[PDB]
Each structure stands twice: as structure tokens, then as C-alpha cells.
Design a protein around this motif. Structure first.
Motif, PDB file in Angstrom:
ATOM      1  N   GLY A   1       0.771  -1.036   0.013  1.00 58.91           N
ATOM      2  CA  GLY A   1      -0.061   0.075  -0.025  1.00 58.91           C
ATOM      3  C   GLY A   1       0.706   1.360  -0.104  1.00 58.91           C
ATOM      4  N   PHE A   2       2.116   1.321   0.114  1.00 61.43           N
ATOM      5  CA  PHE A   2       2.958   2.510   0.376  1.00 61.43           C
ATOM      6  C   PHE A   2       4.052   2.604  -0.596  1.00 61.43           C
ATOM      7  CE2 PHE A   2       0.725   4.630   3.706  1.00 61.43           C
ATOM      8  CZ  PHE A   2      -0.067   3.796   4.175  1.00 61.43           C
ATOM      9  N   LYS A   3       4.570   3.780  -1.038  1.00 61.45           N
ATOM     10  CA  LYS A   3       5.779   3.868  -1.462  1.00 61.45           C
ATOM     11  C   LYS A   3       6.417   5.179  -0.696  1.00 61.45           C
ATOM     12  CE  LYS A   3       9.376   4.292  -4.560  1.00 61.45           C
ATOM     13  NZ  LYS A   3      10.362   3.121  -4.479  1.00 61.45           N
ATOM     14  N   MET A   4       7.494   5.091  -0.241  1.00 62.85           N
ATOM     15  CA  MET A   4       7.976   6.299   0.371  1.00 62.85           C
ATOM     16  C   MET A   4       9.394   7.006  -0.018  1.00 62.85           C
ATOM     17  SD  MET A   4       6.736   3.890   2.290  1.00 62.85           S
ATOM     18  CE  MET A   4       7.973   3.030   2.740  1.00 62.85           C
ATOM     19  N   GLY A   5       9.583   8.202   0.134  1.00 64.49           N
ATOM     20  CA  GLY A   5      10.645   8.791  -0.347  1.00 64.49           C
ATOM     21  C   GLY A   5      11.266   9.900   0.578  1.00 64.49           C
ATOM     22  N   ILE A   6      12.472  10.220   0.965  1.00 64.11           N
ATOM     23  CA  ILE A   6      12.838  11.268   1.636  1.00 64.11           C
ATOM     24  C   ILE A   6      13.980  12.039   0.827  1.00 64.11           C
ATOM     25  CG2 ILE A   6      14.187  11.603   3.894  1.00 64.11           C
ATOM     26  CD1 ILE A   6      13.165   8.724   4.838  1.00 64.11           C
ATOM     27  N   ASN A   7      13.942  13.502   1.168  1.00 61.05           N
ATOM     28  CA  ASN A   7      14.762  14.280   0.548  1.00 61.05           C
ATOM     29  C   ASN A   7      15.392  15.238   1.816  1.00 61.05           C
ATOM     30  OD1 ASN A   7      15.140  17.097  -0.822  1.00 61.05           O
ATOM     31  ND2 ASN A   7      16.289  15.697  -2.027  1.00 61.05           N
ATOM     32  N   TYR A   8      16.327  15.762   1.410  1.00 60.60           N
ATOM     33  CA  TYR A   8      17.053  16.405   2.617  1.00 60.60           C
ATOM     34  C   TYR A   8      16.765  18.096   2.383  1.00 60.60           C
ATOM     35  CZ  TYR A   8      19.797  12.488   3.301  1.00 60.60           C
ATOM     36  OH  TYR A   8      20.146  11.188   3.406  1.00 60.60           O
ATOM     37  N   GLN A   9      16.338  18.657   1.198  1.00 59.83           N
ATOM     38  CA  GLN A   9      16.150  19.984   1.236  1.00 59.83           C
ATOM     39  C   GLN A   9      14.886  20.511   1.534  1.00 59.83           C
ATOM     40  OE1 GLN A   9      17.924  22.607   0.627  1.00 59.83           O
ATOM     41  NE2 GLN A   9      16.883  24.171  -0.345  1.00 59.83           N
ATOM     42  N   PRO A  10      14.669  21.355   2.410  1.00 56.97           N
ATOM     43  CA  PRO A  10      13.446  21.771   3.039  1.00 56.97           C
ATOM     44  C   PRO A  10      12.956  22.694   1.805  1.00 56.97           C
ATOM     45  CG  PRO A  10      15.226  22.301   4.570  1.00 56.97           C
ATOM     46  CD  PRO A  10      15.968  21.969   3.300  1.00 56.97           C
ATOM     47  N   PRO A  11      11.496  23.087   2.050  1.00 58.54           N
ATOM     48  CA  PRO A  11      10.784  23.855   0.985  1.00 58.54           C
ATOM     49  C   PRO A  11      11.586  25.476   1.037  1.00 58.54           C
ATOM     50  CG  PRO A  11       8.941  22.664   2.326  1.00 58.54           C
ATOM     51  CD  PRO A  11      10.534  22.560   2.792  1.00 58.54           C
ATOM     52  N   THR A  12      11.233  26.066  -0.139  1.00 57.48           N
ATOM     53  CA  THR A  12      11.578  27.327  -0.219  1.00 57.48           C
ATOM     54  C   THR A  12      10.686  28.397  -0.353  1.00 57.48           C
ATOM     55  OG1 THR A  12      13.506  26.481  -1.934  1.00 57.48           O
ATOM     56  CG2 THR A  12      12.900  28.893  -2.032  1.00 57.48           C
ATOM     57  N   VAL A  13      10.757  29.339   0.408  1.00 57.44           N
ATOM     58  CA  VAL A  13       9.862  30.638   0.606  1.00 57.44           C
ATOM     59  C   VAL A  13       9.852  31.527  -0.425  1.00 57.44           C
ATOM     60  CG1 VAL A  13       9.804  30.063   3.220  1.00 57.44           C
ATOM     61  CG2 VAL A  13      11.078  31.785   2.268  1.00 57.44           C
ATOM     62  N   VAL A  14       8.725  32.337  -0.559  1.00 56.14           N
ATOM     63  CA  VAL A  14       9.059  33.495  -1.639  1.00 56.14           C
ATOM     64  C   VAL A  14       8.772  34.672  -1.047  1.00 56.14           C
ATOM     65  CG1 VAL A  14       7.699  34.129  -3.843  1.00 56.14           C
ATOM     66  CG2 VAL A  14       8.305  31.702  -3.024  1.00 56.14           C
ATOM     67  N   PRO A  15       9.134  35.728  -1.568  1.00 55.72           N
ATOM     68  CA  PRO A  15       8.822  37.132  -1.182  1.00 55.72           C
ATOM     69  C   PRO A  15       7.377  37.437  -1.489  1.00 55.72           C
ATOM     70  CG  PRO A  15      10.782  37.226  -2.564  1.00 55.72           C
ATOM     71  CD  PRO A  15      10.474  35.934  -2.440  1.00 55.72           C
ATOM     72  N   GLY A  16       6.598  38.159  -0.565  1.00 61.35           N
ATOM     73  CA  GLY A  16       5.329  38.146  -0.542  1.00 61.35           C
ATOM     74  C   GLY A  16       4.732  37.008  -0.403  1.00 61.35           C
ATOM     75  N   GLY A  17       5.364  36.064   0.431  1.00 61.28           N
ATOM     76  CA  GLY A  17       4.974  34.636   0.561  1.00 61.28           C
ATOM     77  C   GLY A  17       3.643  34.705   1.271  1.00 61.28           C
ATOM     78  N   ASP A  18       3.183  33.275   1.311  1.00 61.90           N
ATOM     79  CA  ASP A  18       1.867  32.873   1.894  1.00 61.90           C
ATOM     80  C   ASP A  18       2.265  31.778   3.127  1.00 61.90           C
ATOM     81  OD1 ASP A  18      -0.598  31.772   2.719  1.00 61.90           O
ATOM     82  OD2 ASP A  18      -1.394  32.025   0.522  1.00 61.90           O
ATOM     83  N   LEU A  19       3.121  30.834   2.823  1.00 60.48           N
ATOM     84  CA  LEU A  19       3.348  29.803   3.712  1.00 60.48           C
ATOM     85  C   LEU A  19       4.532  29.975   4.784  1.00 60.48           C
ATOM     86  CD1 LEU A  19       3.176  26.888   1.132  1.00 60.48           C
ATOM     87  CD2 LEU A  19       1.934  27.088   3.323  1.00 60.48           C
ATOM     88  N   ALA A  20       4.874  29.275   5.613  1.00 58.06           N
ATOM     89  CA  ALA A  20       6.266  29.548   6.391  1.00 58.06           C
ATOM     90  C   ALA A  20       7.343  28.780   5.986  1.00 58.06           C
ATOM     91  CB  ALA A  20       5.604  28.477   7.859  1.00 58.06           C
ATOM     92  N   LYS A  21       8.434  29.192   6.246  1.00 57.48           N
ATOM     93  CA  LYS A  21       9.589  28.501   6.520  1.00 57.48           C
ATOM     94  C   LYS A  21       9.699  27.388   7.455  1.00 57.48           C
ATOM     95  CE  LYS A  21      12.215  32.255   5.866  1.00 57.48           C
ATOM     96  NZ  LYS A  21      10.966  33.014   5.375  1.00 57.48           N
ATOM     97  N   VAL A  22       8.873  26.583   7.231  1.00 54.77           N
ATOM     98  CA  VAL A  22       8.942  25.164   8.266  1.00 54.77           C
ATOM     99  C   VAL A  22      10.145  24.472   7.949  1.00 54.77           C
ATOM    100  CG1 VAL A  22       6.706  25.204   9.253  1.00 54.77           C
ATOM    101  CG2 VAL A  22       7.385  23.957   7.068  1.00 54.77           C
TER     102      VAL A  22
END
Ligand SMILES: Nc1nc2c(ncn2[C@@H]2O[C@H](COP(=O)(O)OP(=O)(O)OP(=O)(O)O)[C@@H](O)[C@H]2O)c(=O)[nH]1
Ligand SMILES: [Mg+2]
Lengths: 56, 430
Positions: free
Chosen positions: B341-362
Motif C-alpha cells: 500500500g505504500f511508496k516512501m521517499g525522503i529528501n533533505y532540502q526543505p521547501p523554499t519561501v517566496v517574497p510576498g509569501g503565504d506559507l512558512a519556512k518550516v
């Protein structure tokens, strides 16, 4: 006096009990769905089989 | 290296795309002019300079949307050839965008996409975007896929489309175009992803804290999912997933490919002051029906294989505990013949934020692609709306006059009915 007894039925002003305002307030359950929601037309609605080859 | 080509169709596809490319150029560290103040080869090409160029093609049948890029700040980044604009749009008419006006520009575009594939030494797939209700999105997109299928053949063509909303609608003729397009999509596409605007409105107001959104905020959320999907090919990770892996793992049959999307954590970040957002937290948030990007509750249906993509600080030990917990949950169903039932993947680079952003830099995040029988709910609504109009033949004259033959209306109506029972038979178990 039997006529008087028949005149005063045992309700004793338990009459006209349900008013217009209360009948507005009372909860009304869901009615059956309208015919417009049912409308998948017949010949496609009746189709029998599928294109997926799952069986052997 | 390894390359992916992006094709954008219609108002939705083009102006989603510039949201996607503003993300990638900011992510890799490329200024809007193409200069610099790695994984560039996967999305960009280098010229005889310090300048780069995206591997993208923008297509629409009317010039207003594309010309905004032409006079915008990003005008210097794109090659003038990549921006293709027609003369007069399809007027939300599938026949006009498929037969009469579609064929006026089809061969001009196919040279340009093919020419771009020559520079792609390690081409592995294409990315194609649609909005189903639009004439160009459905009509010209169908003509593009049919030609592309014989041109390339055994290459993975992935699609990312906006399913018409359950109740929110902007076109009256909208049901007609989606079903006719669904015929061309189903045989040729390798795999296509569903999202809908109505769910994206609700998530962007509930999870993210915005009183009044625009298409701009929604377009940025879509870019994050594509960014996480493509991060495996670009940056390092403990478990890499290629495009071809998605094709085999997710789809159990040929005609049942359509998955849905999810992402976590989506948070207005003042709310992120309060919480650490561990791996178990984000894994649980994926499976709530509120976080689905398609407004269909999985509890009406069941789950087939799901793909999980983790980014950032996630450690392989914590993943295994989290997915083990979600299997114990008795609000989540799985079909019997999919015990894995599952396929998993892990990557090291966290998401990138944008000027005038909406999300967090979690620091960590998770993305999901799941195939479920709950999508059968959406097909029933679209089919029902189609039958209401078609019984009295409410809009056929416009289509027939623009090169369409009437016999295609019931035949495209038959295949969806087969797909409707395709999903019902698969939903059964033995
Ligand atoms: N998420 C998102 N959806 C969009 C955006 N722009 C348009 N849409 C959706 O696109 C759907 C209709 O397709 P169209 O906008 O008409 O695209 P089209 O294929 O160019 O139509 P034509 O004008 O005939 O060429 C609507 O349901 C919109 O919700 C956008 O910027 N973001
Ligand atoms: Mg258009």
C-alpha cells in the motif's frame, strides 16, 4: 346535564393548542430527494460491463 | 543529466506556470534575467554565456495572458520562441479548439517542443497542465496528447489538471468539455493528477489564514507540490523516486490511473509558533479529508497504493513509526489485494519561501499522492450534469457547427459509463 357534560368535553381548553408560531419552530425532517438529483439518463444508466480486465 | 519538459495550456496552465518558474529560479539561485548574483540541468539549459534558459513551452489561443509575461519582468528569461499565442480563443468550445482553430497552430507548436527535446540528452518525461472547462485546455490539450503519443511513445507523460468543482462553476458548458476530453486523456496519458479550485479555496482560508484569496495564492500552493515531486531528481536524499516509479507504483490498471493530491503542513506561520510539527504530526494531517486538494471524502471509498514524499529534517527511523501508526487507524481503508500500500521517499532540502509569501519556512514537510475509489463520486456528478443538458440537447449546435460530429457525444458518454463501472468492480474485493 348530560347535554352540559357533552358540551364540556374533557379537553377543557386543551384546544387550539398548536399555534402558527410553534408550527414554524418545529423541526421538519428531510424530504425524499428531488427527481432532478436522480437524472442519469436511462440507456447509459443501464450499462452492464466494463473495460478493465481484472478476471482471469 | 536527466531532464523534464513542461508544457502549459490555457489561462490556467500559463499563469500557473509562471508561479512555478518563479519558485524554481528562486530555489536554484537564478536571477530573473537568467544571470547569477548543481541541478540546473534538469530544468534549464546553458548557452554560450553565463545565462540560462528554462525548458518550458507556453501555449494559448489568445494573446492577453502570454503578453503579460512578454512585458513582465521575466521576459528576458524565456526564449521568444517558447511563448506561443493564437489569434482568437476557442470561446470555451471543445470543437473549436480541437478541429477548426486547434489545427491552425498544432504543427507550429509540435516543432518547438520536439526541438527542445533535442537539447534534453536525458529526457525522462513531460509535464502538462490543463483546466478541464476551458476550450483550449480540453480541446487543444487532447489534440496535443494524441500527436505526442505517437511522436515519443514510451516516455512518461505526466499531467496536472484542475477538475471542475462540485458546485463552484464558471462555465455553463463546462460538463460537455470535460467528458469529451476525458476520452482522449484516458487512453494516451501515462498518469494525471486531479485538484479542484473549490477545495483549494477552502484550504487556503482554513489552514492558511487569508480572508480573500486570488488565483495567485492558489497557483503558489500548486507549485510546492510539483517542487516536492521533482526534488528527488534534483537534490540529494536517502530514498530517491524517479518519474517512472510513480507510473508503476500508483496505478493498478490502465484506466484507473487518476490519483489525488495532499500536502502537509499547510499553516499560517503565526500558528507555527505554537507547534514543532514532528513527523507524526504531519503524517496524521495528510489523511484528514479537510486537507485533500480534491473535495471528495475518502471515507466514502477505499485506498489503493499511496506515495509519500518527505522533505527536510525527516529521518528514516521516524517515517516507519509514523506510517505504522496510520495503518492502525480504523478511519482509513485499504483494498485487500494491496497489503503493502505504500511508496516512501525522503529528501533533505526543505521547501523554499517566496517574497510576498503565504506559507512558512518550516523545517520539514510531507507530500502525498493517493489513488482512491472516492474519485468515483466526482464522476457521478459530472455525468449527471451532462445528462441533464444532453437530454434536451442544450448546446450541441455550437459544437457541431465547429467541425464536431454528433456521434462523438454518446460514444464519449459510453466510455465514462464504463469507467464508472470500472471503479465499481475494482472497489469490490474477494
Ligand atoms: N488554480 C487556478 N485555476 C484557474 C486559473 N485560471 C483559470 N483557472 C480555471 O480554469 C477553468 C476554465 O478554463 P479556462 O480559464 O477558460 O482556460 P482555457 O483553456 O484557456 O479556455 P479558453 O479561453 O477557451 O482558451 C476555470 O474553472 C478556472 O477555475 C488559475 O490561475 N489558477
Ligand atoms: Mg485559452
Amino acid at each position: 346535564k348530560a347535554k352540559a357534560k357533552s358540551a364540556r368535553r374533557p379537553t377543557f381548553k386543551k384546544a387550539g393548542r398548536s399555534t402558527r408560531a410553534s408550527r414554524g419552530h418545529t423541526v421538519k425532517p428531510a424530504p425524499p430527494p428531488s427527481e432532478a438529483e436522480t437524472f442519469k439518463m436511462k440507456r447509459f444508466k443501464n450499462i452492464d460491463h466494463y473495460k478493465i480486465v481484472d478476471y482471469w | 543529466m536527466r531532464e523534464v519538459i513542461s508544457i502549459h495550456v490555457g489561462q490556467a496552465g500559463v499563469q500557473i506556470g509562471n508561479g512555478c518558474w518563479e519558485l524554481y529560479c528562486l530555489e536554484h539561485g537564478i536571477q530573473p534575467d537568467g544571470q547569477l548574483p548543481d541541478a540546473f540541468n534538469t530544468f534549464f539549459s546553458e548557452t554560450g554565456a553565463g545565462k540560462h534558459v528554462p525548458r518550458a513551452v507556453f501555449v494559448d489561443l489568445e494573446p492577453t495572458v502570454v503578453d503579460e509575461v512578454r512585458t513582465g519582468t521575466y521576459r528576458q528569461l524565456f526564449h521568444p520562441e517558447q511563448l506561443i499565442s493564437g489569434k482568437e480563443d476557442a470561446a470555451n468550445n471543445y470543437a473549436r479548439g480541437h478541429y477548426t482553430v486547434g489545427k491552425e497552430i498544432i504543427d507550429l507548436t509540435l516543432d518547438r517542443i520536439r526541438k527542445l527535446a533535442d537539447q534534453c540528452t536525458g529526457l525522462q518525461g513531460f509535464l502538462i497542465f490543463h483546466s478541464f472547462g476551458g476550450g483550449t485546455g480540453a480541446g487543444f490539450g487532447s489534440l496535443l496528447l494524441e500527436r505526442l503519443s505517437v511522436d515519443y511513445g514510451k516516455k512518461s507523460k505526466l499531467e496536472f489538471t484542475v477538475y471542475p468543482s462540485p458546485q463552484v462553476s464558471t462555465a455553463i458548458v463546462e460538463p460537455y468539455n470535460s467528458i469529451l476530453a476525458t476520452h482522449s486523456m484516458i487512453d494516451h496519458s501515462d498518469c494525471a493528477f486531479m485538484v479542484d479550485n473549490e477545495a483549494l479555496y477552502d484550504l487556503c482560508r482554513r489552514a492558511l489564514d487569508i480572508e480573500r484569496p486570488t488565483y495567485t495564492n492558489l497557483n503558489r500552493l500548486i507549485g510546492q507540490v510539483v517542487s516536492s515531486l521533482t526534488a528527488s531528481l534534483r537534490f540529494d536524499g536517502a530514498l530517491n523516486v524517479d518519474f517512472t516509479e510513480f507510473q508503476t507504483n500508483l496505478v493498478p490498471y490502465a484506466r484507473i490511473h487518476f490519483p489525488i493530491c495532499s500536502y502537509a503542513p499547510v499553516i499560517s506561520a503565526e500558528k507555527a509558533y505554537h507547534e514543532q510539527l514532528s513527523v507524526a504530526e504531519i503524517t496524521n494531517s495528510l489523511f484528514e479529508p479537510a486537507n485533500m486538494m480534491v473535495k471528495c471524502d475518502p471515507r466514502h471509498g477505499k485506498y489503493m497504493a499511496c506515495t509519500l514524499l518527505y522533505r527536510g529534517d525527516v529521518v528514516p527511523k521516524d517515517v516507519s513509526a509514523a506510517v505504522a501508526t496510520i495503518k492502525t487507524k480504523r478511519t482509513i481503508q485499504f483494498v485487500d489485494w494491496c497489503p503493502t500500500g505504500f511508496k516512501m521517499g525522503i529528501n533533505y532540502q526543505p521547501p523554499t519561501v517566496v517574497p510576498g509569501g503565504d506559507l512558512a519556512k518550516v523545517q520539514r514537510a510531507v507530500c502525498m499522492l493517493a489513488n482512491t475509489t472516492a474519485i468515483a463520486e466526482a464522476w457521478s456528478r459530472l455525468d449527471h450534469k451532462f445528462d441533464l443538458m444532453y437530454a434536451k440537447r442544450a448546446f450541441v449546435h455550437w459544437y457541431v457547427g465547429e467541425g464536431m460530429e454528433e456521434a462523438e457525444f454518446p460514444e464519449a458518454r459510453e466510455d465514462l459509463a464504463l469507467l464508472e463501472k470500472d471503479y465499481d468492480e475494482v472497489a469490490a474485493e474477494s
